[PDB]
Design a protein around this ligand. Structure first.
Ligand SMILES: Nc1ncnc2c1ncn2[C@@H]1O[C@H](COP(=O)(O)OP(=O)(O)OC[C@H]2O[C@H](O)[C@H](O)[C@@H]2O)[C@@H](O)[C@H]1O
Ligand SMILES: OCCCc1nc(-c2ccc(Cl)cc2)no1
Ligand SMILES: [Zn+2]
Length: 302
């Protein structure tokens, strides 16, 4: 039915495709891997990832600290962890500024991020460019569906940095930031943007994510079957034979390596280096390095 769009399954092939008139709209799908070079830990890297460093909270399992039913029984661990990450001021990475450059080149249809560090915004992506798929800590809400009283960040800090579990002033239920926990619905914007974006995406750029949580993992299968998909990641993600307990639905994954591979490319390494390499192939490398240099300087000056 649809023609094949990559002339070869390499970064060079993706680069030639991006410079063609057929690549008009790029969607970026990113996770915590795009911020580790800034100093923010990811979740699932062995030894260094967050989930291997929560022994002190004596959880039944690491994910419980971000699960809504456990949170409602034992909310203290999450708030203790939240103040462990608060003090750091972080700069966006080369990878963040590559997405910013896609925006300035008119190619960025949308960035879907699982991160809450807001570094996409700090890099210059605007609200309409972004789907913060796993929420934000900027706003908070009571957890009672009958209440849902909204509280600002200043209110949340006042409770946290004063050693009190935030409780709603109307119903005394727990109040948490609008970070999406396991068991919680995603923002409505996620679905309204998804329904429209993935009908008109020419390239999926998947960076710094293990694709281990739904529904975000489903997004790679929402693109048209002809749409090339480039992974820039330390490890292959989304490619595996089926097995009991797999996260992806049947046939919902990447195919980099089988005899039937036709559109998926894995560039294995650091996200910063992968974006530099891709920029170089596109003739954008000095432009990208200038952007990072000038934007990091402007951040420091302010
Ligand atoms: N500098 C790097 N360069 C390239 N890849 C990297 C780098 N650092 C890490 N990686 C890779 O980046 C990937 C990190 O995958 P995960 O740690 O699962 O982060 P997520 O965003 O997918 O977790 C999503 C949700 O799961 C949680 O429950 C939360 O709800 C999250 O929102 C790995 O494949 C690393 O090899
Ligand atoms: O389901 C999405 C959860 C996103 C989330 N990540 C964090 C976090 C807190 C502290 C540290 Cl060190 C690292 C990460 N909080 O919420
Ligand atoms: Zn309430």
């Amino acid at each position: 039915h649809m023609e094949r769009l990559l002339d070869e399954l390499t970064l060079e092939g993706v680069a030639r495709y991006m410079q063609s008139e057929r690549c008009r709209r790029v969607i970026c799908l990113v996770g915590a891997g795009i911020s580790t070079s800034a100093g923010i830990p990811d979740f699932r890297s062995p030894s260094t990832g967050l989930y291997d460093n929560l022994e002190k909270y004596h959880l039944p399992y690491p994910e419980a600290i971000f699960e809504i039913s456990y949170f409602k029984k034992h909310p203290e661990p999450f708030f203790a962890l939240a103040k462990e990450l608060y003090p750091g001021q972080f700069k966006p990475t080369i990878c963040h500024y590559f997405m910013r450059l896609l925006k300035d080149k008119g190619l960025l249809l949308r960035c879907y991020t699982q991160n809450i560090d807001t570094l996409e915004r700090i890099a210059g992506l605007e609200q309409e460019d972004l789907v913060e798929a796993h929420g934000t800590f900027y706003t908070s809400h009571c957890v009672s569906a009958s209440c849902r009283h909204e509280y600002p960040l200043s209110w949340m800090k006042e409770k946290i940095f004063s050693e009190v579990t935030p409780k709603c002033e109307d119903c005394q239920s727990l109040v948490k930031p609008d970070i999406v926990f396991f068991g919680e619905s995603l923002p409505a914007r996620f679905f309204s943007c998804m329904q429209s974006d993935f009908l008109k995406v020419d390239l999926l750029l998947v960076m710094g994510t293990s694709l281990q949580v739904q529904p975000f993992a489903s997004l790679i299968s929402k693109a048209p079957l002809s749409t090339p998909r480039l992974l820039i990641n330390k490890e292959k993600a989304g490619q595996s034979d089926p097995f009991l307990g797999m996260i992806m639905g049947l046939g919902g994954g990447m195919d980099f390596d089988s005899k039937k591979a036709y559109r998926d490319v894995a560039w294995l390494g650091e996200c910063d280096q992968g974006c530099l390499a891709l920029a170089e192939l596109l003739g954008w490398k000095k432009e990208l390095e200038d952007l990072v240099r000038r934007e990091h300087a402007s951040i420091d000056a302010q």
